[PDB]
DNA sequence: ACCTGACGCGA
DNA sequence: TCGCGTCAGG
DNA sequence: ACCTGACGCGA
DNA sequence: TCGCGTCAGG
């Protein structure tokens, strides 16, 4: 399984992810379609229950700033 | 949150 | 190839 | 104040 | 997709 580092990187960018969206008032379908993902996907992250791959990481701190 | 098709990697 | 875990959209 | 169709998000 | 909570007009 995911290392307990891992785990927390996991629950940082969602919570991180969640944060700015609220501030950008999006909702998680709307980040989706910004994130190139499905808003399944988002909530995933959002809930630190699967770290992010390199093309969505690459694309959250483009659209988000979050890195 | 759970069901399922599909990719990543080997007590 | 065979087999579980995981990644992803629905 | 309550009934109901529809959107937001996952102990 | 499935399921409750909530948002909205009636």
Redesign the pocket.
């Given at each position: 399984?995911?290392t307990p580092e891992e785990i927390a990187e996991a629950k940082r960018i969602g919570k991180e992810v969640?944060e700015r969206?609220?501030e950008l008032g999006?909702?998680?379908?709307?980040?989706?379609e910004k994130l190139?993902?499905?808003?399944?996907?988002?909530?995933?992250?959002?809930?630190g229950?699967?770290?992010?791959?390199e093309?969505?990481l690459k694309k959250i701190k483009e659209i988000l700033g979050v890195g």
């Open positions: 399984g995911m969640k969206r609220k999006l909702t998680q379908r709307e980040l989706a190139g993902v499905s808003r399944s996907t988002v909530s995933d992250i959002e809930n229950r699967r770290l992010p791959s093309e969505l």
